[PDB]
Amino acid sequence: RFLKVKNWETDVVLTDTLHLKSTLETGCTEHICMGSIMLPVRTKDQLFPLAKEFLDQYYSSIKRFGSKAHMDRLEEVNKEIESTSTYQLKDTELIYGAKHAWRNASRCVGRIQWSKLQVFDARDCTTAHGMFNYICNHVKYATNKGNLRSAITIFPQRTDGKHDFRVWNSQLIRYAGYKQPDGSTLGDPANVQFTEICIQQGWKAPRGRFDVLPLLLQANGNDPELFQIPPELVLEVPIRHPKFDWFKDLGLKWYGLPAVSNMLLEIGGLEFSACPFSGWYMGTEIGVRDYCDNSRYNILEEVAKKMDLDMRKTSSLWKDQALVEINIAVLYSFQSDKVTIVDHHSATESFIKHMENEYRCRGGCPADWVWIVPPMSGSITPVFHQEMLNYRLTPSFEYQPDPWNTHVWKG
Amino acid sequence: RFLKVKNWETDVVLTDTLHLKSTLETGCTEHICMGSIMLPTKDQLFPLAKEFLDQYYSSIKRFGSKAHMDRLEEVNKEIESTSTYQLKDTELIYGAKHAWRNASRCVGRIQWSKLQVFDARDCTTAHGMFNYICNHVKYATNKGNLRSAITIFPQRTDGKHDFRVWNSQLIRYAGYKQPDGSTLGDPANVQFTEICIQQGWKAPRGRFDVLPLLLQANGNDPELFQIPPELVLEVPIRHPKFDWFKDLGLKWYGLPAVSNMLLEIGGLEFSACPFSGWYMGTEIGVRDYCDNSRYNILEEVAKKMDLDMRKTSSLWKDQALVEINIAVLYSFQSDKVTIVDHHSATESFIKHMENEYRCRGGCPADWVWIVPPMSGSITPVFHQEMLNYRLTPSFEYQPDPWNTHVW
Ligand code: HEM
Ligand code: HEM
Ligand SMILES: N=C(Nc1cccc(COC[C@@H](CN)OCc2cccc(/N=C(/N)c3cccs3)c2)c1)c1cccs1
Ligand SMILES: N=C(Nc1cccc(COC[C@@H](CN)OCc2cccc(/N=C(/N)c3cccs3)c2)c1)c1cccs1
Ligand SMILES: C[C@H](O)[C@H](O)[C@H]1CNc2nc(N)[nH]c(=O)c2N1
Ligand SMILES: C[C@H](O)[C@H](O)[C@H]1CNc2nc(N)[nH]c(=O)c2N1
Numbered sequence: 036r037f038l039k040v041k042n043w044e045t046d047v048v049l050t051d052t053l054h055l056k057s058t059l060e061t062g063c064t065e066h067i068c069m070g071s072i073m074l075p076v077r078t079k080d081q082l083f084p085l086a087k088e089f090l091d092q093y094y095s096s097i098k099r100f101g102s103k104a105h106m107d108r109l110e111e112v113n114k115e116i117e118s119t120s121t122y123q124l125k126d127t128e129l130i131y132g133a134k135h136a137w138r139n140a141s142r143c144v145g146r147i148q149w150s151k152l153q154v155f156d157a158r159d160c161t162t163a164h165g166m167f168n169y170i171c172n173h174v175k176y177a178t179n180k181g182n183l184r185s186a187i188t189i190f191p192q193r194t195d196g197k198h199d200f201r202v203w204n205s206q207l208i209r210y211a212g213y214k215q216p217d218g219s220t221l222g223d224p225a226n227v228q229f230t231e232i233c234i235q236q237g238w239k240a241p242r243g244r245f246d247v248l249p250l251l252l253q254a255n256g257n258d259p260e261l262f263q264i265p266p267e268l269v270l271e272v273p274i275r276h277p278k279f280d281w282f283k284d285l286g287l288k289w290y291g292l293p294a295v296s297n298m299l300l301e302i303g304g305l306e307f308s309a310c311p312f313s314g315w316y317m318g319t320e321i322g323v324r325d326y327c328d329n330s331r332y333n334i335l336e337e338v339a340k341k342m343d344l345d346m347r348k349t350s351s352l353w354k355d356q357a358l359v360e361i362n363i364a365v366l367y368s369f370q371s372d373k374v375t376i377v378d379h380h381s382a383t384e385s386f387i388k389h390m391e392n393e394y395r396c397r398g399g400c401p402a403d404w405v406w407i408v409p410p411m412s413g414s415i416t417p418v419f420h421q422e423m424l425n426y427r428l429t430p431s432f433e434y435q436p437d438p439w440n441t442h443v444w445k446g
Numbered sequence: 447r448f449l450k451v452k453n454w455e456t457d458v459v460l461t462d463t464l465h466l467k468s469t470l471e472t473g474c475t476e477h478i479c480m481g482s483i484m485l486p487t488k489d490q491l492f493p494l495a496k497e498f499l500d501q502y503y504s505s506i507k508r509f510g511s512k513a514h515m516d517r518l519e520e521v522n523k524e525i526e527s528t529s530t531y532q533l534k535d536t537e538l539i540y541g542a543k544h545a546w547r548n549a550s551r552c553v554g555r556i557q558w559s560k561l562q563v564f565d566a567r568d569c570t571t572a573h574g575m576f577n578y579i580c581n582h583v584k585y586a587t588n589k590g591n592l593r594s595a596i597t598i599f600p601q602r603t604d605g606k607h608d609f610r611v612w613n614s615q616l617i618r619y620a621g622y623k624q625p626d627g628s629t630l631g632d633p634a635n636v637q638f639t640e641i642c643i644q645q646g647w648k649a650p651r652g653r654f655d656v657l658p659l660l661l662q663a664n665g666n667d668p669e670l671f672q673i674p675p676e677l678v679l680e681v682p683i684r685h686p687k688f689d690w691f692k693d694l695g696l697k698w699y700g701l702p703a704v705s706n707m708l709l710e711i712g713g714l715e716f717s718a719c720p721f722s723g724w725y726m727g728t729e730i731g732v733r734d735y736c737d738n739s740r741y742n743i744l745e746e747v748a749k750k751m752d753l754d755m756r757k758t759s760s761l762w763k764d765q766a767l768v769e770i771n772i773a774v775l776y777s778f779q780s781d782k783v784t785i786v787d788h789h790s791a792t793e794s795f796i797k798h799m800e801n802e803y804r805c806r807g808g809c810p811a812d813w814v815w816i817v818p819p820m821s822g823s824i825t826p827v828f829h830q831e832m833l834n835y836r837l838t839p840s841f842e843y844q845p846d847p848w849n850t851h852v853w
């Protein structure tokens with residue numbers, strides 16, 4: 036079966052066959068589309084087919100499909116599964132797997148970069164202190180004094196589900212949030228629950244608006260332990276505007292390194308529950324979502340006040356005006372400090388070129404429109420006009436439940 | 447089978463049961479989501495008739511009464527006999543309102559119950575269609591205090607006697623390719639514009655020429671009619687702070703009126719069913735004015751603003767976009783022509799969804815269409831999970847008539 040997608044601005048038509056290799060479910064059926072829903076121990080039985088499918092993919096990519104090395108590797112993995120109930124990936128397979136999970140991430144607009152990913156193998160790690168050391172090294176490498184480099188650090192895989200490695204942080208670097216008795220929030224409201232956990236575990240909270248949270252790290256199914264990232268490794272950018280000199284006095288800043296730490300990486304049926312990964316920001320992530328969401332820093336009013344916009348009616352588009360200025364400020368600030376960032380015009384144009392390249396060489400590129408289209412100025416980016424097909428390929432990044440909801444406390 | 451949708455801004459969670467009534471298919475499967483794809487007998491008709499009459503009699507709280515049973519028998523008799531049937535006025539009105547209510551791509555459905563239905567099923571010629579259309583235009587425009595309306599022409603019979611409005615909307619602007627290579631006016635309408643010329647329209651070859659109506663009665667060849675200019679309310683576009691804006695020479699029409707869709711009620715097909723409401727400001731300012739393949743004025747406006755167009759990261763496109771949209775709203779508001787901004791329309795839609803979840807068990811909604819084409823995440827609909835499914839009565843797409851028609 037062939038499926039076509041059209042770009043309605045250019046009339047370019049592309050043909051998808053890669054969807055035929057999809058196994059996992061979408062959430063949709065013939066009677067209902069769930070495309071806007073945010074979230075829609077293995078036995079030997081299910082494991083060897085998953086391992087085989089993955090090794091067949093790996094061996095094809097290196098132009099060795101059906102070779103003696105391919106056949107010997109399948110036999111070796113098969114015996115390892117039936118003897119030990121699991122198996123270990125070779126370094127080369129781990130690298131390929133992590134890169135492909137990114138390549139397959141249908142919600143990711145930055146995938147033109149997928150083949151440039153520094154993979155740190157942390158599968159020899161045994162303790163939380165060991166995890167802290169690996170994570171510091173990743174942060175220092177990825178940061179590279181502002182010239183950001185994409186990276187992933189991969190801790191040991193799941194075994195019986197009772198010895199999981201987990202980073203409890205949603206991101207390696209994030210600001211604390213504090214609910215006040217009067218119901219207001221100091222800092223980032225998205226992180227209130229996690230901040231509370233940290234405090235309970237012994238963190239002394241400075242209680243400011245931009246306090247970098249400590250790492251809360253779980254090795255081998257043990258209780259997690261707190262560590263403070265050395266401040267000298269946390270690169271931050273004060274936010275100012277190129278024309279409006281009062282903008283600096285809003286007291287805003289953000290961190291340069293976006294580093295997701297709560298997802299699960301699936302490669303060949305193996306589950307890596309701690310696999311923090313980092314790249315760099317698209318400007319709207321900070322300026323639209325982090326700053327202007329009502330449930331986040333929520334600065335629109337204060338900015339519109341200072342611009343002296345007409346706030347008596349929504350039809351003045353005061354919110355839209357303030358939004359663009361804040362986003363100009365974020366890009367200006369990062370650029371001025373030589374910290375890598377990409378604007379939403381450049382990022383989406385590159386994604387369209389990536390997607391076309393993937394249709395030609397790979398036969399497809401799964402993409403989630405709801406996520407790929409930026410949260411401002413949607414239709415003046417080329418992705419708004421691009422039809423996309425969403426389907427799930429492995430290797431993959433997946434959601435997993437928050438560890439405080441599942442952890443068995445040892446005491 | 448019972449499904450939950452969450453608003454991630456407010457934590458409000460709604461439970462959908464209405465999807466279980468859905469009958470038609472979505473395009474998606476368990477392996478592939480096609481949510482962003484723009485277009486995915488006698489024996490056939492009685493179940494469709496019965497399904498509809500069942501919801502109608504339930505709506506007036508007379509489900510399983512003598513009048514309900516008698517109606518089902520009567521229609522059953524009429525299909526057996528004639529191979530089709532006729533809707534009562536009350537059913538036609540209910541069906542049209544529900545076709546809007548069920549339109550999953552429409553952010554304006556809080557209004558669904560206030561629809562004026564003009565029954566044009568007695569119409570027999572293109573001149574008659576022109577008359578009904580003029581009356582609809584005048585009624586809906588209401589000197590700028592716009593009122594929602596639909597005009598329903600005779601239903602399909604054997605399919606060789608179709609009523610069609612060839613126009614995509616009742617009021618739209620001409621598009622012309624030039625030797626120059628550029629496009630004068632609206633590039634979306636170049637092909638239709640040339641069909642009109644081919645049929646004998648005398649185009650003035652300007653930027654904003656209202657197209658003639660091309661009307662097909664009873665499967666006959668379509669005919670041209672100019673809408674009286676006095677019935678076409680237009681708005682010159684100016685900006686409340688920038689004096690040079692008016693120099694761009696921009697205007698738009700007040701009445702959005704879709705004329706190329708098919709209304710399905712109770713298995714019957716109404717292939718000419720022009721409907722109108724009023725504009726959300728972004729339709730004109732973001733899409734009509736700034737789409738690359740439309741009037742595409744972003745460059746010219748940015749220049750008059752003297753923005754740094756060297757680098758995309760200055761957000762010059764974005765700045766220009768906001769100002770164009772401020773101007774569209776200001777112009778309509780100043781001239782007292784109904785318009786709604788994207789903030790107001792999306793807030794109303796969230797209130798409508800809550801009403802429908804409470805009173806009906808759900809509200810089919812297509813997030814890709816409902817979220818406005820600018821400032822998405824600062825509108826509440828961005829944060830609202832939506833389930834999309836197909837209920838009937840419905841509006842559907844149909845092939846353009848020039849590809850079908852036998853001359
Ligand atoms: C290199 C620069 C990168 C940029 C500018 C980029 C940009 C983005 C953006 C804007 C999103 C949507 C985020 C949101 O709204 O919260 C996203 C999602 C995602 N990205 Fe990329 N990305 C990049 C690199 C990567 C890398 C290196 C990985 C993995 C190795 C990756 C995996 C993903 C995944 C798994 C998601 C979806 C998360 C979810 O479903 O919640 N990204 N990225
Ligand atoms: C009263 C004011 C109304 C407003 C402000 C409104 C707003 C909208 C908007 C903004 C769209 C998206 C259009 C686009 O992007 O091209 C839409 C789609 C739609 N609307 Fe409404 N609408 C209103 C009344 C109505 C009425 C009266 C009907 C039918 C009787 C209706 C049926 C639809 C349908 C069928 C679509 C989708 C068309 C498609 O899928 O191509 N609308 N509406
Ligand atoms: N509860 C909410 N959100 C939510 C709940 C569960 C899951 C999710 C999934 O999105 C999580 C998001 C934001 N927290 O993850 C951040 C993210 C993921 C991927 C890429 C991101 N940005 C990047 N640029 C990169 C990071 C690493 C490499 S590139 C940023 C979101 C809310 C929504 C609205 C208000 S609160
Ligand atoms: N070829 C393209 N698009 C396309 C092709 C086929 C079908 C479609 C579907 O969209 C049809 C759109 C306009 N194109 O219909 C207009 C419409 C429909 C419904 C509501 C609209 N606005 C209103 N406010 C109302 C009208 C009537 C009552 S309210 C406007 C779109 C293009 C994309 C970019 C430039 S052209
Ligand atoms: C490819 C994509 O589905 C297409 O560009 C859609 C996106 N969302 C839209 N939303 C609305 N309201 N109107 C449109 O024409 C479109 N176009
Ligand atoms: C309900 C809806 O799916 C949700 O708000 C989504 C919409 N699109 C998004 N797109 C991105 N990139 N990130 C997000 O968090 C979201 N949120």
Ligand SMILES: [Zn+2]
Nearest residue numbers: 063068474479
């Ligand atoms: Zn779907």
